[model samples]
Target chain A: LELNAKTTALVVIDLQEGILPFAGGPHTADEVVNRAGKLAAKFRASGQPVFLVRVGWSADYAEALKQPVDAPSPAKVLPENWWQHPAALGTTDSDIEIIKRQWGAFYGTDLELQLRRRGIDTIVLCGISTNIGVESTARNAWELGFNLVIAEDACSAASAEQHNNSINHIYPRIARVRSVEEILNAL
Target chain B: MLELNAKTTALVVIDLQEGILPFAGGPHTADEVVNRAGKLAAKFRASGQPVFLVRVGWSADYAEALKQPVDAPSPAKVLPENWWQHPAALGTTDSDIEIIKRQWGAFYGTDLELQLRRRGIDTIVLCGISTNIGVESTARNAWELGFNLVIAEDACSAASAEQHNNSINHIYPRIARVRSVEEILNAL
Candidate 1:
């Protein structure tokens, strides 16, 4: 599929230090970061917006969602640099940085507003935890009327099964699943 | 998991309308989904909790449908007769909250969230057709909205087994509880 460079943006989710260390998956966190970083650089070169999304909580954890679920999150205090974008990404002030408190980026963030304000109608997404943060963001973007392309090779989850499930089943229904090379070529 | 509070919980059944039911693919048949969902709806109604029957449709010209470009776009088709009618098996009542969604998710263009919030409903027991599509989309939105979610696995089906199983096993677990209808009823 051809991408509309002027109207498309690249959104990379939860590739931060803390989250990456927890990602044991079909693709290693380092591999995903490398690929996502490449895509971000290409998008920047093409004069398209690149969004670096990170998930973090307040110092008191008051901003974290407290809804009870069957599988509750284990309590663990995060490191001071947990929310930092890795050095591999080469993040710069030119790239848009979005801080999300929940699994999905759009709900409590200005992601949609930023995209709309820039006249972006399509988004290319890739990140760690394909089924959680990335999938949640993709679903929200789909419902919000944005066309999507998931950079499958640049995304990983807690397991290979989880990553493949989202790429093979979930993403196809809502977005096109493309590799980093394919996305870069399209751009 | 703790027992669900009947007052704060509601059952949301998605896209089980007559027209869509015929296209349901599965490890579970459309009939099986209807039967399980119907039973669950009955229990919710008996407990005086709300049941939301959601369907998808658009104007005759399909003006309201999403025009986004995708690799696997839904094929164009004319809306069939009774496309929006919930099956009689659901035993939909006037008191049941009826939501007509223009998109995959019920919350976007509809009063679903408003209705739930007005009723002080914070927990949702979600079920319906196409587990990976409408059901998962709605589940994602509900979870992000800070609502506790329970997905009745047996009461939902998708166009493919992989689609259904993946959502149940991988996706729902992160955002909600995946349980059988029996377990949900027992919890309620």
Candidate 2:
């Protein structure tokens, strides 16, 4: 889509390849990956900012890691990727990468200033574990005053019910949740 | 009052005197003072996380500010001395004394500091109209947040332009930029 690429930024959150296989998502990780890849490619082709974010806690490993990740070896301990998918699903060299060590990305990180420096006023988001990392980041962004649109198809939670609940619940209230096609059309 | 002095400092917001000589009040100066006063009220009372306010906006009607008008009663003025007075003829020792001074300077450091600091408050918000008088005086004492103001112009004024303009030009905006009362009132 032809648009003012400067005003918008695509933010992919908690989508590391290490967490995808367990999703039971609406579509396969490869399909979701392909779609998200297409979005990144199109946006990059149009010269828009792309920020890829994932949760990686220094101490929170003991505090919040609750599930086994995409790769398993020793009987699951701490510091696992509880929210990220496998590398084939999320990550690239072209996008800006952010590693957050807290529940909220902006809590102790420079995410806000980075977005401000990029002149990103509108953020289009897609990712996994919607209720945790996505919700935390979304709430912070809302408070900091940025317009948000989440791509429903491109995101997955532990369960589709929980994921859809976040989408429907927060859209009209705190954010705008649109279909992947809708986001593509808007772009 | 036999109450704990800890966590119980008083922050009084006195005399939003609505009618009579509606000073920085509703339908008066567009409720500018009242609204800006509300901002200070919220900032100190809610957001500041460490404050208590002495609110003196009274609803009682005054029978003496007028000689019994036959039609509608003259708007209730803040009778500065009625125990139920607008500025409070009486307050808890824990409460900072809020009085409508006949002139400026609300008693040279009376129980104000004793009351606030006793309750552990080293800060104060000096606002409300007759801004040059009460609000400004408390603010000017270099000890204050020094015009650390949440003051609004519609919320304060004086008996004459001589006093108003002097304080507005020379001291204020330098110490504290008189804010817009109407805008603050409308904001959350």
> What TM-score, computed on C-alpha atoms, does each candidate reach?
0.95, 0.45
Clashing residue pairs for model 1: none
> Across residues B10-64, which tens digit of lDDT does each residue of candidate 1 receive?
9999999988897778868999999999999999999998999999988888888
lDDT of each: 0.88, 0.51
Give me the candidate number with maximum lDDT: 1
Indicate which candidate wins on TM-score. 1
By how many angstroms RMSD does model 2 differ from the true structure? 19.8
Tell me the lDDT of model 1 at B56: 93
lDDT of 1 by residue, A118-162 (tens): 999999999988988898899889888899999988888888887
